DNA sequence: GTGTGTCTCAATCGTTTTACAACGTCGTGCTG
DNA sequence: CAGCACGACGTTGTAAAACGATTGAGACACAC
């Protein structure tokens, strides 16, 4: 699962093609509670790990990861009449990348539910 | 197989009506010893009974209340025979398998 | 789905506090203690007890819900309303209710089951 | 050593078929 | 010869015993 989230964060262009087999296998699980309990959690608790490839696929989602490089400043010294020197629409650019996230996320966890 | 196709007033009319007090419900228990004749043989003695309340019947085994198609396999299973039986002759109809 | 929903709130909340501040919802359920489905009679019996054992001020007026369920035909119902007359006794002490807890009970020393 | 979480036993609410009891249909046995 | 009686015989519309799919509640675990 970890070359499985790799795979999905840095090539988008079969993203959801291991997508449309690995809930397939989710067919194949064991049926009874005694096997299905497996590796247990640090706050006490014990799941099947199977689980955890789903939250794993979007635990990626594409995060983004340049935070920095799209405003020609950092924070002003007074904000509250006017940003000096940044540009609140570069501020402002940030939603554009969190679309490519937020309308993503529900997107692939809607293939799924 | 008998008592089968009772009603209301038959499965009240084979308990006691008396001054005692009204009595509710009515069981009979029967205790065999068979070596082998019937096939669960790992009970040397089994035991039957069926107990009757004025709105329920159940059959049994060894206190296990199973249901009838069961019991009635079991039965079966045995040298028993379900419909009326030949070594069975009740009171006066003794002149029956001379006349059918 | 009327008999998934009050089995559901039998457990769900696990605080009667909802019914702090809807006492209309009480009046809701109150209402049906008298239906035909004896499935539903006794959730009605199991909610009821739980609302008494912390809002404890409602002696009286709930009382009544209670041992009318004792002369029903489902045993389910008068197996279950028993016990919660036990809780009731000792909670309660006001001997005039305490009375009429007995009466109900000696009356149904004999019972077709 | 104490709460865990999973496995196994009892009522009840639609269906289903199935035993049962009423009703024409014949066929043998008589009597005029 | 023919007419009456009558008694077994085969359909047919039923009500009830029974049937399977739901729930909740005791007894095995563990595993820190």
Redesign the pocket.
Known sequence: FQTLQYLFRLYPYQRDFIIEESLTNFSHLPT??????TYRLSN???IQYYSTLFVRLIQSCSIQNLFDSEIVQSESKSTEALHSGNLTEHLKTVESILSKSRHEEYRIANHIV | DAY?????EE?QALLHEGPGATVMSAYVEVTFANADNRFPTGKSEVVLRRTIGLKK?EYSLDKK?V???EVINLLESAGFSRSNPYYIVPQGRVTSLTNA | LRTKCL?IINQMKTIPSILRTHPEVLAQIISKSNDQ???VRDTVLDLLGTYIMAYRETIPQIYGCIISGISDP???VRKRAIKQLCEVYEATEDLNIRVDIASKLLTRSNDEE
Do not use: P
């Open positions: 009874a509670r005694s096997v299905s309990r006490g608790k014990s | 089968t196709h009772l009603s209301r499965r019947d209340t249901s009838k198609t | 089995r489905s004896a499935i489902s045993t389910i």
